[PDB]
Amino acid sequence: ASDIQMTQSPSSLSASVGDRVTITCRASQSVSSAVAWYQQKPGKAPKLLIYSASSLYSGVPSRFSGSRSGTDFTLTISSLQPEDFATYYCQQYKYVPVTFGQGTKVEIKRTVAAPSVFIFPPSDSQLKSGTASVVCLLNNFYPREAKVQWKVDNALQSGNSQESVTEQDSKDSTYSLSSTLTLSKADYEKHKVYACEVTHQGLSSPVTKSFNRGEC
Amino acid sequence: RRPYIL
Amino acid sequence: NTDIYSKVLVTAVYLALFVVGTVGNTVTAFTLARKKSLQSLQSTVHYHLGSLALSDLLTLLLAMPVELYNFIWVHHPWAFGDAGCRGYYFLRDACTYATALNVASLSVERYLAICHPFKAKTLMSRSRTKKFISAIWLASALLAVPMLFTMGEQNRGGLVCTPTIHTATVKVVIQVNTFMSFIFPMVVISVLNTIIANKLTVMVHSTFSMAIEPGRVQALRHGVRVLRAVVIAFVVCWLPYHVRRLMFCYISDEQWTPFLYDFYHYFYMVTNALFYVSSTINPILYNLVSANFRHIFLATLACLSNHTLSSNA
Amino acid sequence: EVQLVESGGGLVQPGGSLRLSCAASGFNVYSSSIHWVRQAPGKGLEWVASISSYYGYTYYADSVKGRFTISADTSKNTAYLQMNSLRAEDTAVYYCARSRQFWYSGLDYWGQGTLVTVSSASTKGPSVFPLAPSSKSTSGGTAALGCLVKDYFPEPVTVSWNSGALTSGVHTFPAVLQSSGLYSLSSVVTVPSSSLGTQTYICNVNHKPSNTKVDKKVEPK
Amino acid sequence: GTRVFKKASPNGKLTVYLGKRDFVDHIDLVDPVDGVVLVDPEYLKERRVYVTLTCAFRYGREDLDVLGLTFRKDLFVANVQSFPPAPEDKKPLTRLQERLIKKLGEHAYPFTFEIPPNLPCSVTLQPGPEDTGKACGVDYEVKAFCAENLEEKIHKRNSVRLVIRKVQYAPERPGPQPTAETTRQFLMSDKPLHLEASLDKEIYYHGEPISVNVHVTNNTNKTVKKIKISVRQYADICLFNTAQYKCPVAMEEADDTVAPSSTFCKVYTLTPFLANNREKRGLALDGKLKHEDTNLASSTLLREGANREILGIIVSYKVKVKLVVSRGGLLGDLASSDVAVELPFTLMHPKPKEEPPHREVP
Ligand SMILES: COc1ccccc1C1CCN(c2nc(C3(F)CC3)nc3ccc(N(C)CCO)cc23)CC1
């Protein structure tokens, strides 16, 4: 065995309280039953859930169950509680290069919310410093799957923009987006047209906000 | 004479 | 009163015996003492083997250097005084007693271990073996301390190393020395070794099995042949010595001639060479009987289908 | 109480060295195996090294075979991970984990994890840039106001609006690592347009590792 | 679990199914070795399929020019005829056998071996640094072969061999606390030197530390200059003659001094492991399947009364606490009289709930 690859098919999953959650892990080579599952909350260490592909670790609630069929392994959560929203990893420990899966994040589900888009031009201090970073802030949007297109001065900008994503609110359970468009001191003044287009699937049609130099 | 040595 | 050629030949054979016996006994002691992990707890033959090897080595070292200087070359001046003339004889007699008792104790061990192994498992232990070895050495010393009183120095150049006590006591001290050094060891060794050889043949060259290491066994080559050759050699290598020591004192003040004088002066060297041969013979028997011992001794001398799958029912 | 305590993580240069310590408590080094697992920021778990200490064997990942060295102090019941020739790809949170030596190889006990940062950059304070709300361009019912934090390398800088007075859903965002090597984060909040020209909103940006606190105010033009 | 092990013959016509490879030896009875063998009646051509359970002692011979050549001495042999069922002389079917037969069809035939008690467990003797061959020790093996009669030359292509292990686990109820005491009076002493050593528990697990509480009361005029405490493995091996071996697996030499007319009390902790004992050739290890690393051999649990003199390997452990005393009066103080006690203890694995294999292998 050169190096076993553990492939978790669901990279991200959304489910409600009480639903049945099934996460599967595929091994590129037969690793027998030497497979373990781990739960990891944000900022905390991973917690072992099951081992030997079926055995439940002490203290783990009976909701979690593991099962092996062939070279594949499956972790099932019955009656998904609000405490079960975390990232789950499958690990094989049959060869000393023990390998983990890429992880499966379990999210909460509710009604789809429409994003709200705001555009903030760079301040005078930013222009005076020498670097311009115009940002468009995307407010609450449930699906979490969106994109940012600038098309500043009728020219699309890509390969430099960076996007930030916050986690679900502890009560609202909705995300937010903040994208930064890098620009230079001369680049900001050269082009007087800026925009931020949203490719969110929640809205029926794309929503675009446009801005111009000197606008309040 | 005698062997003298034992 | 000896020819130069005879003295030269005796000196040469004595030096060859010295080197052979010293090397063999020292390497034997190292082999028996060079232990590894997982020491056996029910085997005690190595203790007796080491005791006998040490006895032979002490005989060699405390016999040849002193004897060759004065007795072999019929030197008239005894190079020491009275303390030396007593101590050398005491040490020599202690060495002979230790050798005889060590061979007898080895015969007793082997037989206990062969005839009644299950009895000897509890009857014989390492602590008991050490106690027995110390007891036989102390008995050898306590039997040889008579020689301290018997021997002395006289004048008759002219330093004389002779038993200075009256011949009446000498003829009885030599008698008891010969008895306890030859006759009892002779009967014990002969009887026990003959019984062991007979038992080996009825129960069956690779006739025996010995667990030298955990899960490792070895065969005992030439068992009965060596078991009888040891008795034959002890008879040959000792009986002339004791017969000479007896005839030195059991002859009256008659039948004394220069012919008998020279005969004694030559028979002394002959019988002492025969006596010294036994001090070298033992490691040779050890090598040709035990393969593992021979291997370690020579090393020290040189260094000196398908595959199982899985499924579900 | 079975636990593992980690220490020795922090800032390194791309080529420096570190030693991590796992103070084991509640179990022996001969009935347990000690493993090191790192998690790069935003990535998953990756096993690094392991020590058995009963069979006297040590294992390493193929990417850290020569640079990393794992060892255990039996008397102190402490395992060590000495990492040399550190690279930027070694930036991660390193956990020391335990497994049964006999008849088990899953990780049942984990440490809290020590973050290890490897970059050429140095500690630097932030520079706040106000984000003036565009009432002529923002269609939200409540006006959106934010502040920009840029060029701060060390541990994340705390940002508070009006010294924590604002409770209108302040959305702080995780800092991203720019090409230069310095982090940048933005904090936004939706405020009703009624108090746009009356209520002054000040975002307090306090950076403890750099000891640089800057206060800024945002007001629409 | 529901998993099974299968192994086929070189020609592929014969295959053996086992639900386990380690069988627990409870002190009264052992786990039955029940399995299923799948045959090819169109290929046998009026032949028979025999399954054999063999307990064998593998040993080497040092009086040989060839190195790494070993023998086998059978300690227990059992035979069953499988493809033609016995005339109602067939063991009852276990549930695993039912599942295997229903899964495999009509050409699957069961076999069951009942290992009698007082038989040796699987123990492997540690080979030396220079040893190229098969490790010595006692192991069990299941072999199925197609043959016309039992007394025939077995062909390699028509037979399949499977190594199995007989194991024991730590008793649930701990025994009395191991306590040893001694009183020593020297030659010109007339006063007693008292030594009291004890262990914290009677049963220990592999990799678990051992605590020795040593209390020395020196009422004599001699000085204890060094305290030696070691854990020793005892191997009672009966292959052709009874032999006992002793091996220290953990040592602790302490330069602790006890003055005359003084009292001493200390606790010492020791842990036997294999990493520092790999050079000791012949050391008893737990039974191996092929070559994998195993811990030190577990303590062999014998019957309640007598039932000794087993023809395999019996493993036990003791803690020896030795006090060395500066002898004076007759020697030059180079040697030292030793006062020692021994504490026997049990060193085994706890009762598990799954397969022992850790599944860790590069
Ligand atoms: C000096 O030789 C004597 C004198 C009196 C009685 C017995 C012996 C034997 C000593 C050596 N040898 C052995 N004999 C036996 C007998 F069983 C046949 C009695 N077992 C041995 C076991 C081991 C061993 N070693 C050399 C140790 C290492 O392998 C030698 C012998 C043959 C003669």
Author numbering:
A (entry chain Q): 20 to 235
B (entry chain L): 8 to 13
C (entry chain R): 57 to 212, 220 to 267, 283 to 382, 404 to 412
D (entry chain D): 24 to 244
E (entry chain B): 4 to 365
What did the original publication write about this model?
Further 3-dimensional reconstruction and refinement generated three distinct maps for the NTSR1–βArr1–SBI-553 complexes (referred to as complexes 1, 2, and 3), with global nominal resolutions of 2.65 Å, 2.83 Å and 2.88 Å, respectively. The 2.65 Å resolution map presented here represents the highest-resolution cryo-EM map for any GPCR–arrestin complex thus far. In complex 1 of the SBI-553-bound NTSR1–βArr1, a PtdIns(4,5)P2 molecule fits well into the density observed between the detergent micelle and the C-lobe of βArr1, likely contributing to the stabilization of the NTSR1–βArr1 complex as previously reported. A close inspection of the high-resolution density maps for NTSR1–βArr1–SBI-553 complexes 1 and 2 disclosed a distinct configuration in which βArr1 couples to the intracellular side of NTSR1. In both complexes, a loop extending from the N-terminal of TM6, which corresponds to the ICL3 of NTSR1, was observed inserting into the cleft formed by central crest loops of βArr1, engaging βArr1 in a “hooking” manner. In complexes 1 and 2, the finger loop of βArr1 was positioned external to the transmembrane cavity of NTSR1, forming a pocket together with other loops from the central crest of βArr1 to engage the ICL3 of NTSR1. The unique configuration of NTSR1–βArr1 assembly in complexes 1 and 2, referred to as “loop engagement” hereafter, is observed in a GPCR–arrestin complex for the first time. More significantly, the cytoplasmic end of TM6 (residues R2946.26–H3006.32) adopted an extended loop structure, deviating from the typical continuous helical conformation. The interaction between NTSR1 and βArr1 involves two primary interfaces: a major interface consisting of the ICL3 loop of NTSR1, which inserts into the open cavity of the central crest of βArr1, and a minor interface consisting of the ICL1 of NTSR1, which interacts with the lariat loop of βArr1. At the major interface, the hairpin-like ICL3 loop, which made a turn at P292/G293 site, penetrates deeply into the cavity in the crest of βArr1 formed by the finger, middle, gate and lariat loops.
